[PDB]
Amino acid sequence: YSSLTVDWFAFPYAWKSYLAIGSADRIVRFNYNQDYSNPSCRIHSKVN
Amino acid sequence: FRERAPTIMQYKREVFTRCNYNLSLLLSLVQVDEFVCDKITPEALATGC
């Protein structure tokens, strides 16, 4: 690749619907809006 | 949101005509677990006739 951008934050796993594409919630609207113009993959993980 | 919840065997249906809604009010009363949508998105449900 020419660049590798990683955006990370803490978020509960019960709220996957608030980050799915097409969501109308306040979290996408005011906190985090994903680019979706470059090949991207959003993963949900638990870190020990 | 303010009545007895219907069963799946006898579910309720309401058809809305000639009225104005406000989807931002309805999304605060619920916590959404999953939405499965065809040919539309909830952000499109927020705006359109």
Ligand SMILES: *[C@@H]1O[C@H](CO)[C@@H](O[C@@H]2O[C@H](CO)[C@@H](O)[C@H](O)[C@H]2NC(C)=O)[C@H](O)[C@H]1NC(C)=O
């Ligand atoms: C649609 O519903 C939202 C949710 O209630 C309304 O936002 C409220 O507006 C009042 C008036 O300013 C505030 O006191 C509340 O704090 C707001 N609540 C939220 C959650 O933001 C909104 O005004 C409604 N839309 C219209 C056109 O009335």
Ligand SMILES: CCCCC/C=C\C/C=C\CCCCCCCC(=O)O
């Ligand atoms: C469209 C308003 C009129 C219909 C109201 C009837 C039921 C509304 C109840 C919940 C509305 C949620 C719609 C989008 C669901 C996913 C929200 C999101 O995470 O993006």
